[PDB]
Design an enzyme around this catalytic site. Structure first.
Site, PDB file in Angstrom:
ATOM      1  N   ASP A 161      -3.246 -14.331  -0.943  1.00 48.97           N
ATOM      2  CA  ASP A 161      -2.746 -14.560   0.420  1.00 48.97           C
ATOM      3  C   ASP A 161      -3.941 -14.586   1.391  1.00 48.97           C
ATOM      4  OD1 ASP A 161      -0.087 -14.406  -0.386  1.00 48.97           O
ATOM      5  OD2 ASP A 161       0.072 -12.254   0.159  1.00 48.97           O
ATOM      6  N   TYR A 204       0.855  -1.233   0.000  1.00 49.58           N
ATOM      7  CA  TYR A 204       0.000   0.000   0.000  1.00 49.58           C
ATOM      8  C   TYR A 204       0.876   1.264   0.000  1.00 49.58           C
ATOM      9  CZ  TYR A 204      -3.380  -3.490   1.618  1.00 49.58           C
ATOM     10  OH  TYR A 204      -4.196  -4.615   1.811  1.00 49.58           O
TER      11      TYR A 204
HETATM   12 MN   LIG Z   1      -3.521  -8.760   4.291  1.00 50.35          MN
END
Ligand SMILES: [Mn+2]
Ligand SMILES: [Hg+2]
Ligand SMILES: [Hg+2]
Ligand SMILES: [Hg+2]
Ligand SMILES: [Hg+2]
Ligand SMILES: [Hg+2]
Ligand SMILES: [Hg+2]
Ligand SMILES: [Hg+2]
Ligand SMILES: [Hg+2]
Ligand SMILES: [Hg+2]
Ligand SMILES: [Hg+2]
Ligand SMILES: [Hg+2]
Ligand SMILES: [Hg+2]
Ligand SMILES: [Hg+2]
Ligand SMILES: [Hg+2]
Ligand SMILES: [Mn+2]
Ligand SMILES: [Mn+2]
Ligand SMILES: [Mn+2]
Lengths: 340, 341
Positions: free
Chosen positions: A237, A122
């Site tokens: 994930d 991010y």
């Molecule tokens: Mn995560």
């Protein structure tokens, strides 16, 4: 009473997942539950480096979006950042001290490590689409609507951690601490851990998927492709993370692990149900802020609300809970292109 | 009084490394100390998978080794396994609750994670050199000499964790619990963290390096080469880990991060020195016992003792401590072949 290397030679195959003897030797030649060793192997096979992802075209795409779409995109991204900031540290600070089998211990550390990679991804996106990342990050902390949507996540973890400290320091019993009577019940702490896991299950199984749908709405427009590649890797994930909590919970429910946990799972079943209902309502309530300045073709409060209901029913059925919402077909089947 | 998400907007560039506001947002676009961001990046670039290393010929080499050499090899591996079992969980349970800047928080989680890969690699080696791994794993917990060499490591972490819990739960002051007085002092907790970090620095910078001398002595003889490839990758990681604790310790003693920590460091200068010497002494005692049934080709108790004294001087000087031993050049320069970094 916690120790980083318990001195008793114990059979690790016979300890409960949680609350038994802290793990001493980290070994992976055998496991009480091979599903956690399989998860560690799969997560390691998925290792990715965010910085390698080309996001050079996302800045052009982002600045070109109309203002309301920048709001939708960034408000979503800030929430993902908040969740992974919490998920990077919390499994290690709240779960690690209570684990008593090596395969689950290493799985939790691997899972938490993979969340720090998401956080780093991010930062990679943010620094490349805006001129001052600080405004974005600072808003995560102070944004009332963001905190409103996440209300209860940090609280849950914090309360479990405090109760765990009392337990490790004082042991079970009723104590007198600075003149106040403090009760330390292992059964109450097992309930707290158990519901914390159910809450983490909702966080990864529902809150993150709603956020993925918002991110992929931009990818369907052929925009923010660097972000989309990263969200696709993050989603892959998260699928493992939620597989891990679904198995922890369903194993505890089966009575094959700590028997007391199977009693607790049955006894605290309405509370499990209630926390999923509350998280779904919070994800819905976020729409008013998300679409405050306007919605987008194929993405608005109604579609978001339908998807929340759809995915909540699926996740609740997967851990044995009754379904709160009317059944429906997937309102946004295009998301399957991105979730592979 | 700890929280997984502090709701106060704070300037993360101005918090101290430890004891400040718990980290809320995990961001990596800026840092107070960029060394921790550089370490995260380098550790991630070094990512490796133990299963990717061929250890198929190590079984036959181990079996052909004379019994005292099997004993040396396996004792040394059991100690490496004990150390990384502790290092996989401890930086996370002991340090995470006290960190107040994000780059250090993620570095610690990244460092700890890299240690679980080490633990996984010892299982890969052990499974491939013995019929029943359980014989080797169970002897780690109660092995008398192993307990003696690593004596004290878990107690430093354990005491720090216990004092941290009291601090988060009750805060500073004189408290009572079930009829007894319990005093919590932030100054004493800072001292416990400082000594725990100095001990972790000795663990990774001296204890592990002595074990590497043992492992690579076999590699020099062209034996246990699967093991050698794995220890080479582990040593490349350890160089980063000790680089991280050296920087934490130097930033704490210089006074640039927390003036109180600088006063504390000076105050335990003697204690810290004697603990370093104690760690060196335990490593020598282990060597003396290990080479009791017989020396090995290229390594013996005296050569190892010299190596311990050589690396201890280097690491103590790196964190500003006086040298306890006679300065000498490296007694085993061949080891540099295996210690990239
Ligand atoms: Mn995560
Ligand atoms: Hg939780
Ligand atoms: Hg959405
Ligand atoms: Hg339940
Ligand atoms: Hg709806
Ligand atoms: Hg430490
Ligand atoms: Hg320590
Ligand atoms: Hg050795
Ligand atoms: Hg050796
Ligand atoms: Hg050695
Ligand atoms: Hg000291
Ligand atoms: Hg001191
Ligand atoms: Hg010192
Ligand atoms: Hg020391
Ligand atoms: Hg020596
Ligand atoms: Mn996750
Ligand atoms: Mn290691
Ligand atoms: Mn290390």
């Amino acid at each position: 009473a916690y120790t980083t290397f318990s001195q008793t030679k114990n059979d690790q195959l016979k300890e409960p997942m949680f609350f038994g003897q802290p793990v001493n030797v980290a070994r992976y030649d055998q496991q009480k539950y091979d599903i956690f060793e399989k998860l560690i192997e799969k997560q390691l096979s998925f290792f990715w480096r965010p910085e390698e992802v080309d996001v050079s075209r996302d800045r052009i795409d982002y600045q070109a979006l109309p203002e309301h779409e920048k709001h939708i995109f960034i408000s979503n991204l800030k929430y993902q950042t908040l969740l992974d900031s919490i998920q990077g540290r919390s499994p290690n600070v709240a779960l690690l001290p209570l684990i008593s089998i090596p395969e689950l211990e290493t799985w939790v550390e691997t899972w938490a490590f993979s969340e720090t990679i998401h956080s780093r991804s991010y930062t990679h996106i943010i620094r490349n689409i805006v001129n001052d990342p600080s405004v974005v990050f600072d808003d995560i902390v102070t944004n009332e609507q963001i905190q409103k949507r996440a209300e209860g996540i940090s609280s849950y973890y914090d309360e479990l951690i405090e109760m765990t400290s009392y337990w490790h320091l004082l042991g079970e019993g009723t104590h007198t601490v600075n003149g106040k009577t403090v009760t330390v019940s292992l059964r109450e702490l097992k309930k707290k851990l158990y519901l914390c896991l159910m809450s983490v299950n909702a966080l990864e199984a529902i809150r993150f998927y709603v956020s993925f749908a918002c991110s992929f709405a931009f990818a369907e427009r052929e925009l923010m492709e660097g972000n989309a590649k990263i969200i696709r890797l993050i989603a892959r994930d998260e699928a493992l993370h939620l597989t891990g909590t679904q198995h922890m919970l369903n194993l505890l429910r089966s009575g094959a692990d700590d028997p007391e946990m199977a009693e607790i799972a049955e006894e605290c079943k309405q509370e499990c149900y209630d926390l999923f209902v509350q998280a779904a309502q919070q994800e819905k309530d976020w729409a008013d802020y998300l679409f405050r300045d306007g919605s987008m073709i194929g993405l608005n409060k109604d579609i978001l609300c339908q998807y929340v209901e759809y995915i909540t029913n699926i996740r609740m059925q997967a851990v044995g809970l009754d379904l709160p919402f009317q059944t429906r077909s997937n309102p946004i089947p295009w998301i399957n292109t991105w979730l592979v």
